[PDB]
Amino acid sequence: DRTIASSRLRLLEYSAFMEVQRDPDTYSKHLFVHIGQTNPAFSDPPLEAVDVRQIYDKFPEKKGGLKELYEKGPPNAFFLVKFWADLNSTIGPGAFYGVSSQYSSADSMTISVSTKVCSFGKQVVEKVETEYARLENGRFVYRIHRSPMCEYMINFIHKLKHLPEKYMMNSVLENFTILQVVTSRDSQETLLVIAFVFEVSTSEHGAQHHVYKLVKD
Ligand SMILES: CCC(=O)N1CCc2ccc(-c3ccc(C(F)(F)F)cc3)cc2C1
């Protein structure tokens, strides 16, 4: 619906950030990538389709693979989001690097989230998070607050930040991807798959993003 959603699970918000404490009462937070809760509008164009086969080689093959996953379906659960990252932090040791996200659902479940960082289509790291339903407003929501980033990514961001030029940053990111797979913890049915491809915001405008639906013809 323009929404990143399946029939069983919707991603409401996604945020990868760093927080630093300026003084005992004051905190600063820079967001690298962001997806914000929007309400679908009736006038919103339908999402563009990207053939799932063109990105097979960006994420790992075979088991746990997008091909195998897409083969398992449901296909209306597979999304691709392109991220324009904000690497301009006006913000040292002790900063917190986290990811916060919310999902929603008509059904109450125990979700397990799998996130695979990928370099040149090879998995560098998997993080697995379990999150629990809470009843809000005609739906259940799942809230992941300040899930810490792992070192691989802290080092990646820093070193990427350290490159002199935004064009070089984008070249590295051309072969950096993240695959998120959300299952129902017990049954392992697929609820939501998002593939994450990245680019540096050359604008210096704040971070942006764009959603596509993955199809298979
Ligand atoms: C293994 C799990 C883990 O650590 N994760 C998963 C969730 C997630 C999503 C995006 C980013 C990210 C941050 C900054 C840039 C930028 F450097 F390009 F700006 C690019 C990507 C980092 C993370 C942290």
Swiss-Prot record:
Preferentially expressed in the placenta. Residues 1-217 are annotated as: Transcriptional activation. It comes from the Eukaryota. It is found in: Nucleus. Transmembrane segments: none annotated. Interacts with YAP1 and WWTR1/TAZ. Transcription factor which plays a key role in the Hippo signaling pathway, a pathway involved in organ size control and tumor suppression by restricting proliferation and promoting apoptosis. The core of this pathway is composed of a kinase cascade wherein MST1/MST2, in complex with its regulatory protein SAV1, phosphorylates and activates LATS1/2 in complex with its regulatory protein MOB1, which in turn phosphorylates and inactivates YAP1 oncoprotein and WWTR1/TAZ. This is Transcriptional enhancer factor TEF-5. It comes from Homo sapiens. The gene is TEAD3.
